Structure formats: structure tokens, C-alpha cells
């Protein structure tokens, strides 16, 4: 189970940084994805605060979104919706092969459906703007705006994986300010 999760995460992140369309086999009609931003999250300070411009419109931080319409619009269900959410997240590199020590992980049983829970914590570099600009031009889709900076972010991501070979039933991504100091460091 600990090795089955290490492999899942290793392959997942390879494709998450390379070709996200290749991940879509993992998701089915009832599968769920949402992403939430926590701009207040503690981190080591030392350019100003983190610019979350690419993430804010799609953020399902449910303490900050009150209307039912907006709450359900930021939840993606099924492969099509989920793939569209993935296209609106900045392109990344997670340095898990070279520097696996930036990351921590828990893996344990889900109570039903013979599933397992996998939660990953760490950081990434942003290497390019998202394929689809979901932040609100010839250089990007959607309405015109000034250039949003790319920067490192820290994050936590939780998968519920079930037999179904492997199906991601639930997938929640939390985005927060980069912290170069964290409790599992060195």
C-alpha cells in the first residue's frame, strides 16, 4: 500500500508536469476535483506577497464563497469538467525524482469501497502560464489583463483511489504560499 501509493504519485506527477490529458483515464463520470487557495497560510518570510491571480477565480475555498451557484461552479465532475480545470492551472515541475525530500505523504485505508487515501505535501515551480487562462489577447485566451507572474507555490493534495484498474474518486488540491522551511526538511 505504501509502495502502491509511491508509484501512483510518481507516475501522476510525471504526467501532471508533462501531459495532463494522459491522466484522464484515472477519472470517471462520478469522479470529483476541486482546487482551493489559502492565501493566509503560514510560511517562512525571507518581492511582496504571493500573486495568486491564475488560481483565484477557480478557488473553492468554501469559507470565502457563499452563493450556491459559485460553490457548485468551482466543483468539477467527470472527465470533461476535470480536464478543463487542469488546463487552467499553471504548468509545473515537481522535483520529486531528484529531491523527494521536499515532500511528505500519508497513505491509509478509506472506510468503504476498498479504497485508499493518499495525501501529498510539498512545493512546485511554475514553468509556464496555463493552457487556458481562467484568471478573469493574442498571448492568451479570455479577456485582456496585465501579465501575472509565475512563482513557486506550496501545496497539499488528497486522492481517494478505488479499484473501480485505479480510479480517482476524489481529488482536492490546496494552493498556498511557498515555504522553504517545513517540518520534514533535511
Amino acid at each position: 500500500s505504501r509502495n502502491l501509493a509511491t508509484n501512483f504519485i510518481a507516475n501522476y506527477l510525471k504526467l501532471w508536469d508533462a501531459n495532463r490529458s494522459e491522466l484522464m483515464i484515472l477519472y470517471q463520470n462520478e469522479s470529483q476535483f476541486s482546487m482551493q487557495v489559502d492565501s493566509s497560510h503560514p510560511h517562512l518570510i525571507e518581492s511582496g506577497s504571493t500573486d495568486f491571480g491564475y488560481y483565484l477565480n477557480n478557488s473553492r475555498n468554501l469559507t470565502r464563497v457563499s452563493s450556491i451557484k459559485a460553490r457548485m461552479a468551482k466543483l468539477s465532475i467527470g472527465q470533461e469538467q476535470i480536464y478543463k480545470s487542469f488546463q487552467q492551472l499553471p504548468k509545473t515541475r515537481h522535483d520529486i525524482i531528484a529531491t523527494p525530500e521536499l515532500f511528505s505523504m500519508e497513505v491509509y485505508k478509506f472506510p468503504t469501497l476498498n479504497g485508499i487515501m493518499i495525501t501529498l505535501h510539498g512545493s512546485f515551480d511554475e514553468v509556464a502560464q496555463p493552457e487556458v487562462d481562467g484568471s478573469a489577447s493574442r498571448y492568451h485566451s479570455g479577456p485582456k489583463h496585465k501579465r501575472i507572474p509565475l512563482s513557486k507555490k506550496s501545496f497539499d493534495r488528497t486522492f481517494v483511489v478505488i479499484p473501480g484498474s485505479m480510479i480517482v474518486a476524489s481529488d482536492t488540491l490546496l494552493i498556498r504560499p511557498y515555504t522553504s522551511d517545513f517540518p520534514w526538511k533535511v
Binding site: H43, R64, E106, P111, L113, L174, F182
Partner: protein, 165 residues
């Protein structure tokens, strides 16, 4: 949402139970009545992981009791909920709830029962809060959240950032 609305009050109640201020004239504090209120929404045999280390149930003490006795030994805490999201997973009767918080701790030297271990040292009492720790927490909770009984099946509680102090 439809089904996520009740999650926020539940989360705030759960966090407030971890941050419970002990109240009371009697010679020794009521340890058990205080400690059994800590994280009381946990189920007796819930799976609990704190900073990657699981709580192992013994024949003498179930997981919830072990957690409460360990949590009792922390200084008074104050959690601030900063984000949450939740998915109702079909055919499970459960939510997965992924939330984040900041938490700070009483630096006064008193424990949760108001007592300090300062006898040998050279020495109203309000808590003196330290710096913010970051926390990421994942719960699996029964779909019927409006009850504040024992509804949490598992908790994974993880410091993401620990300030120098």
C-alpha cells in the same frame, strides 16, 4: 453548496473542542471530564495520524482515548480555519473534507489545567500566544454532519510550517 454548507459550522465546532479552555472550588482538576471533550467528534476507533505518525490502538485504550491523552499534554491551542473544501463521495455515506488552518499555542508555561512546572526555576493569567503554525487536515466524516456526535472516521493532521520557537 447543497451538501457542504453544514461543514463550516461543524469544522469550527471541532476546532473549538481542540482549543477548549478548562473551567472550574476543588483541590484537583477534573482531568477526565475536560479531556473527553477534546476532539469529541472523533469516533472511538477512528484512524488518527499526527505529523505522519499513526495512533496505534492497544487492548486497554482505543484510538480516540489515546489521542485525547496526548492532546491534553499540548499547551492551550487556538486554531483559525483558513480554507476548506469537501466532496460527498457517492455510495459511501461519507464526505472527504480537506481543510487548512493556522494554530498558535500558549507560551505562558501553564498546561491546559492552569498549572506550571516551575518549582525549581527562578520565577490575571491570560494565555500568551506564540507564532502561527500552518496545518493541513483531512477528515472522512459521516454524511449526516448536523449531529455533533461521533462522526469522524479518520483524521490526518499535519503541520506544514513550524515557526522557530
Amino acid at each position: 453548496q447543497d451538501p457542504t454548507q453544514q461543514l463550516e459550522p461543524f469544522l469550527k465546532r471541532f476546532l473549538a473542542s481542540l482549543d477548549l479552555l478548562y473551567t472550574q472550588s476543588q483541590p484537583f482538576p477534573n482531568v477526565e471530564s475536560y479531556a473527553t471533550q477534546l476532539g469529541s467528534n472523533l469516533k472511538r476507533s477512528s484512524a488518527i495520524i499526527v505529523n505522519g505518525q499513526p495512533i496505534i490502538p492497544s487492548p486497554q485504550e482505543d484510538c480516540k482515548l489515546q489521542f485525547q491523552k496526548k492532546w491534553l499534554q499540548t499547551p492551550l491551542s487556538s486554531h483559525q480555519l483558513t480554507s476548506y473544501d469537501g466532496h460527498l463521495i457517492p455510495g459511501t455515506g461519507t464526505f472527504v473534507v480537506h481543510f487548512s488552518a493556522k494554530v498558535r499555542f500558549d507560551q505562558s508555561g501553564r498546561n491546559r489545567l492552569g498549572e506550571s512546572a516551575d518549582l525549581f526555576q527562578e520565577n490575571n493569567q491570560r494565555p500568551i500566544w506564540g507564532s502561527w503554525f500552518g496545518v493541513d487536515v483531512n477528515l472522512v466524516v459521516d454524511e449526516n454532519v448536523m449531529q455533533d456526535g461521533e462522526i469522524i472516521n479518520s483524521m490526518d493532521y499535519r503541520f506544514t510550517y513550524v515557526p522557530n520557537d
